[PDB]
Design a protein around this ligand. Structure first.
Ligand code: 723
Ligand code: 723
Ligand code: MG
Ligand code: MG
Lengths: 143, 144, 55, 56
């Protein structure tokens, strides 16, 4: 897979919206609890992600927040190609499993989400997802 | 060395911007946080610790950085704290400079902050800061 | 390098992306599909591939 | 080793600790803070493990 392809999707827990991004080639993920499942929140999440990693292509479903004009504006500003229409779907299930494992270690869901992201990215198989994405991108960097 | 970070807060438009810089690379991350508290600082650290190998954080003695909540987060994530160079202070000025250049391109400050972080990390020298941190960390992974 | 997003027919949702043809101090001239439109500056958002250029 | 407890007592809102975890009940926890043994209700105690540290 290309080092610049990401999949984004939303999942829900305890009445709150969780926006999840996965680097397809590595399995590395990032997640945020967002106050509303809107294009404004999705566009802000993408600009943060695009500043951290080389984000060239994002694949989402046709959720209204992902097709919003605000997201189109952010992707044009950051140089991100959008494509519409199971890695992230299975990742939502994996994230929810890890959240439940550590849920009692935190009062707020947002804390447990970031605990679960930590565990997912640091767990070794071997390399961890966090080690794989760093390795994949560094190899892609030209001399 | 690839796990050393400097964190500090700066202010614009009455709002608090929490900035983390990977000292060895100059790579930065920034968030506008609703309050300059240990609660918000600890949440920022847990997110940061999940992205990068964060082993040591250098801050000043701001109450949010010395708070018990942050000590709790650092204990959970395995982060060593050290208090009391100028890299982050000089980075706050650099970040504010880029924010003003792109401020009119966005209504909300939080949007301009993330535009400025993008520009700082993608700008070529040469390598960019975003390329350097990935290179530094990957080199420490592949050589072990 | 430029894409324009805009509002016009009393529709609050931002339309576009449109091609930027000319930029005046009070309005911009854009092309969306086969229709050429004149949009006031306050009702238009000219967005640059600014981050894209910093590659 | 693996557990640190932060707590509030004496009507003081600032979190004290870290304290050693002796026992965790559903209603209270038994802790030791610098030779002092204390019993603290669950809502006034936060038991934090180096879970991420060990998992990483
Ligand atoms: O419970 C939450 O979701 C986070 C949280 C923590 C905390 C921070 C890191 C790991 C686990 C919990 C906390 C910790 C202390 Cl020592 C005091 C107040 C605190 N208040 C909070 O809200
Ligand atoms: O102005 C902000 O701070 C972000 C923002 C954008 C925007 C997003 C990325 C780059 C530039 C502006 C926006 C864009 C459109 Cl086409 C419609 C509504 C919008 N509303 C917003 O709030
Ligand atoms: Mg979906
Ligand atoms: Mg400071």
């Amino acid at each position: 897979c290309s080092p610049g392809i990401w999949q984004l999707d939303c999942t829900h827990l305890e009445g709150k919206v969780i926006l999840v991004a996965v680097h397809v080639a590595s399995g590395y993920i990032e997640a945020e609890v967002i106050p509303a499942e809107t294009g404004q929140e999705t566009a802000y999440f993408l600009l943060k992600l695009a500043g951290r990693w080389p984000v060239k292509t994002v694949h989402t479903d046709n959720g209204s927040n992902f097709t919003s004009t605000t997201v189109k504006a952010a992707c044009w500003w950051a140089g991100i190609k959008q494509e519409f229409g199971g890695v992230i779907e299975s990742m939502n299930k994996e994230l929810k499993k890890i959240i439940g494992q550590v849920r009692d270690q935190a009062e707020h869901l947002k804390t447990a989400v970031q605990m679960a992201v930590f565990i997912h990215n640091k767990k070794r198989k071997g390399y961890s997802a966090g080690e794989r994405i760093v390795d994949i991108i560094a190899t892609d960097i030209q001399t």
